[PDB]
Amino acid sequence: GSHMTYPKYLLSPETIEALRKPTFDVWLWEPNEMLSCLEHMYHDLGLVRDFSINPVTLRRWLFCVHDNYRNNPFHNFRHCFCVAQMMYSMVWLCSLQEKFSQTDILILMTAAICHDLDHPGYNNTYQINARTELAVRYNDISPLENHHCAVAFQILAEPECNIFSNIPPDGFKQIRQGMITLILATDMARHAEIMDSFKEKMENFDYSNEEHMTLLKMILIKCCDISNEVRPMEVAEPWVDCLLEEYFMQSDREKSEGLPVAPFMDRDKVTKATAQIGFIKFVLIPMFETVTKLFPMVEEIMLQPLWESRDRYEELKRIDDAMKELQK
Template sequence: MGNGSSLDSSKVIYVEINGKEEKIVFSRNCSTLDIVDFLRKQQELCRMSLKDKAGAHVTISPTMPTNTAANPYKLVAKEVKRVDPRQEILQNVLTQVAEQFNRAFKVEETRTELTNRLNVLERRLEVDNLKAIEIEKCKKDISELKTQLYNNTKKLVDYNSLSALSDDGKISLKRDVPSYPKYTLSQETVDYLKQPTFDMWHWEPNEMLSLLEHMYHELGLIQEFNINPITLKRWLLCVQENYRNNPFHNFRHCFCVTQMMYGMIHLCDLWGKLPKEDLGIMLTACVCHDLDHPGYNNTYQINARTELAVRYNDISPLENHHCAVAFQILSNPETNIFANVDSTTFKRIRSVTTDMTHHAKIMEDFTEYFTKFDPKNKAHAMIMLILATDMARHSEILEAFKSKIDNFDFSNEDHVNSMKMVLVKCCDISNEVRPMEVSEPWVDCLLEEYFNQSDREKQEGLPVAPFMDRDKVTKPTAQIGFIKFVLIPMFDTVAKLFPPLENVMVRPLKDARDRYEEMKETQNNISVGSYFIGCCSHLGIKVGALGLNGG
């Protein structure tokens, strides 16, 4: 979803060096080698290690746990063994023998030849890497030019109409688009990827593509759907290219939602309760759930009478558009990850098992469309899950799921579909489940997108929602109600079916609610204080004369 404007890019740790406590501040973007070199210079050590107060070793890396001044880490020097004089004599003898051996068998000439060959290979690799860098730079330049073009023309042209007219051009993936580099993931990263605490801000787009690819391999979806690994790479690249550079609804948000779903699959042991086909559908729905999002919500689309709203009769225009783009990408043989499944399986992937009672309520104007499907058939799977992310349907979907919790049956298709919709919804709005340093930048991104929309609505004379108005909303007021009345009730319900989520998701949400309420109270106190001082100044009264100067 883009970088948050208030993202704190530094990290603080306390280290005891030479018996003296030192405070060290470093950027989250620096490498492990940078931190090691810095610590080594402080004590002029060749080898060293970092230990906590209990004597446990601490890994030196940007992700090391933060500590406090009361519990500093200790920098410990490792002894370097001195070389025995006898070993030095033996080394000299071996050196002389090696020289004679070189003269006799021309080893030096062979070494030189091998070195030259290695240099040629290194130069070749360097050229290839430069080509890859140039390609990435070109892609970035093209993206910036697109953004600049939009900024120059948005006052004259309807941005949503442009999007609808250019779908075909955007969805096609050129054959010469390079695949992203292959990254080898450490076991630490593999384990971390399954946690709701995962910090996606430290990962570049190419790295996120590799992590998504790993999810499909690790869950066994490559074998389940007989996916060509090259096609998977092309599909992921095409998906990335069809997410816009919005402050919030962008490719990083796509990755964030998918990673949370991947984590929930493991935390809830879903791979032991659902078939792999269902896991693949849920993961793919998360990847595609906001494709080509224009950065303006359904309310704007409907009030502004955009082409998307007209096309879908004001019924979930964005979610319907995301579905359409997803299946347009899959209609291209080069990017169709489901190309090798039989027609029946593909119909299940695209279709939904339908309890049409709630669909009919919201999509009553689509009666003709729905008559094509058997209400008892397993149809619209991906479409159902993506349409479920429309917040206008939140209460309806959650209440349907609540009614099934007490007697939930994993063999009941209607129960499982209701659960899948709620899980996708949870992942879509799960930012506050994550640690504060990960979640808070997302709030800034979302508010930026809201403010962009409300500014445009004011310019066009359209209704403005109070929670989007930069003159009325603050960060705590934006989050408190959402966490209390939307997130906690939904995650609390899911935790009844999956108890492990109580500690790892519901508890962090309650902590986030308390934190924002404290933030709101602090802001209110500051506002009251400023107002009081302003009144005193207006009346010519000195605050100190009232004994309120803190003395």
């Protein structure tokens, strides 16, 4: 509709609009444009307003978070943009602003954005088995996540990046604590435990009970973190090739170094379709199914796509198997 042309990092009104939905094409955007989006989220959600974030600091902070992600095939800045943007979608799709405080929203967002800071592209199993410095340092306890978290607060400690610089120390402490819980919650080692906790509370969920809410926030950050297959098929599908890229880098290394190899990461045994059929069926669907009990609109917007994806990979699998049978 626009009478002249703008720079990319001036998001158009349509981009700003699209950004509220999970249909958003995360791939269309370069890092600056992504950084502008994350910026707008913080303003749009009323977090700049309500926590007096100096708006140039918001930017420096974002820029600096971005510098601290690595160029991993999957665990990179675009990943965090996805996780952050899915949280944003969900604040709208589940009207989280009715249920949550702005302090909770600020934690969900800053945790989302930071939750994979300085990821090395090899998981906790590698760290632990290779007895890496991180694994030694964190006593084999959620080493990566504890690391992301530390880098998170090291950035915020720099005064030019400190988006919380104008929050009272009580609020800071409250934000810090949420952020830590949430970022450690993203360790998939704890998935069944966290899911069981949540389901127990879900027997009689209570929005005024802090414990209930911490479990809900943990499920929300977990949803956004592994949510790629909720996105449109053209947007989701390239991620899987990236994740397999990293997964294979590790299992090569693991073979060469004489360490155990996850069959789910073993080049020789994972294929895409088999990888995702199981993840969608037994991790993603069930998780969003229980979310839907609190937020029924989540079914239409996020279970449906997951069903379609499950069903397509089932189709693709039927065809791989035929063909891999002609390799023999």
